[PDB]
């Protein structure tokens, strides 16, 4: 679920999901179109595609269970949707962590008109 994903992001990166990742670039928060602005934005692009692979799941509301094994994120067995949603979120949180080095505040609240074109998953 969205709130769960948000806590995973905070635990991983030390940034609050809102507002750090909720309106970043072309794809973070309300992704949709255009060339991703940077690596972090690409993490959201891929996450969007990841959710897109699950058209009969409900990532915003469906809660999955996971644990931290030392620092490792380990998705625990739930429903198929939950498992798949968890893997999507786990990947995004790791991706955000791996790209904190290039995260740029200038992309927060990035305006829609600067995001044009369809990029295929």
């Amino acid at each position: 679920s969205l709130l769960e994903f948000g806590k995973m992001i905070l635990e991983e990166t030390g940034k609050l999901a809102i507002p750090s990742y909720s309106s970043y670039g072309c794809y973070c928060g309300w992704g949709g179109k255009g060339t991703p602005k940077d690596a972090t934005d690409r993490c959201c692009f891929v996450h969007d595609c990841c959710y897109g692979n699950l058209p009969d799941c409900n990532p915003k509301s469906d809660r999955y269970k996971y644990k931290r094994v030392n620092g490792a994120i380990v998705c625990e067995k739930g429903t198929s949707c939950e498992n798949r949603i968890c893997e999507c979120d786990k990947a995004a949180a790791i991706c955000f962590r791996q790209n904190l080095n290039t995260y740029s505040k200038k992309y927060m609240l990035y305006p829609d008109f600067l995001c044009k074109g369809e990029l295929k998953c």
């Binding site: 969205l2 709130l3 994903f5 948000g6 992001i9 999901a17 809102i18 990742y21 909720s22 309106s23 973070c28 928060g29 309300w30 959201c44 996450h47 915003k60 995004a92």
Partner: peptide, 5 residues
């Protein structure tokens, strides 16, 4: 705040 990734 419930929405936004």
């Amino acid at each position: 705040f419930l929405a936004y990734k």
